[PDB]
Amino acid sequence: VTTINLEDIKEIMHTTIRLGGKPESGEAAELPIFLGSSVEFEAELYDADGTQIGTAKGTSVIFAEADGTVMQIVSAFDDYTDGGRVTWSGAYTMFPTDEPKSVPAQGVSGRYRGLSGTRTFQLLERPDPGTSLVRSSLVLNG
Template identity: 40%
Template sequence: MAEASTEEEAIVLIDIKEVVKTKVTRDKREGVGVCVEFENDLFDEKGNKIGTCVGTGVLSANGEGEDERFQLFSATDHFEDGSVLWTGPAPHLPAEPTKEHAVQAVGTSGRYLGKKGTRHFQLVDRPDGETTILRSSLFLRG
């Protein structure tokens, strides 16, 4: 994980391996309105655990087709030196699984406090129905 930070410069965390564990929390039905909770472990490129991410996702839709579905996420990354809140939509079943997605992020404590930017994530693997492996990054300024 490459990292850079000063008071005036950006905070950049890249090449984060994110192991997502999800569970359906409202009911077992499929479709719009299903809510999932997730707890993710965040690792640097050497395999060291650097933090956790806790959040929710709600399945929504802009229309009737499967490609019209998306998930609205809200989560907080917790690192030893502070935390970052991120929220936004991403495709439910991406047509291009390797495409990177970005959502808005804001620092809520520690060295991240008050900084704003984006949280990026990209599907790497889905070994089972409750586990997803992502490659993530975080870019903040302020």
């Protein structure tokens, strides 16, 4: 039974962050709609020795649940030079912002195809709105 286990991924994430808010014009202004704050990102992925192992790209958007829990939804994927492509997506709690977060992941190509598991990501440093340092990990099996 195959198990894949990437720990201590260094993830350098180039972020485009958008405030959102009430639409002002267009069809959306005539509908009950708020635009959520969003992050569009591209990232380089490195192993714990600093060797690049791949890249990532995705989008996350802020929303809230009935109980008042502020959430983020993300849809993203990794490309691993060695392993292949791994999609990942789900909703996770926004707060606290410095704890590790995880959503389900699916391997879809290369040696990762047909395995599924969990993609993890923890914000270490956000020095400016353009780049974040993330500590990441991936487990797949099947």
